[PDB]
Amino acid sequence: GPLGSPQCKALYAYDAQDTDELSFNANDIIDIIKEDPSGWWTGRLRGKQGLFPNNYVTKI
Numbered sequence: 001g002p003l004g005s006p007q008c009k010a011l012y013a014y015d016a017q018d019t020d021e022l023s024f025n026a027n028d029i030i031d032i033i034k035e036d037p038s039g040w041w042t043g044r045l046r047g048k049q050g051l052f053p054n055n056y057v058t059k060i
């Protein structure tokens with residue numbers, strides 16, 4: 001593609017609340033794998049994959 005694969009930048013830190021969730025720090029860059037319509041997106045960051053709330057991030 002002309003652009004990289006989709007990413008977003010965390011606006012706020014998120015601490016996973018379940019085993020299927022992803023934790024990250026504010027300003028972390030997350031690779032987006034899936035964008036569920038609920039806003040629970042699937043991301044990868046530093047050797048972790050998991051669900052995270054999209055209201056904590058901004059697409060870049």
Ligand SMILES: NCCCCCCCCN
Pocket residue numbers: 017018020021036038040051
């Ligand atoms: N712990 C996250 C639960 C929220 C539900 C995520 C939706 C996944 C749908 N495959």
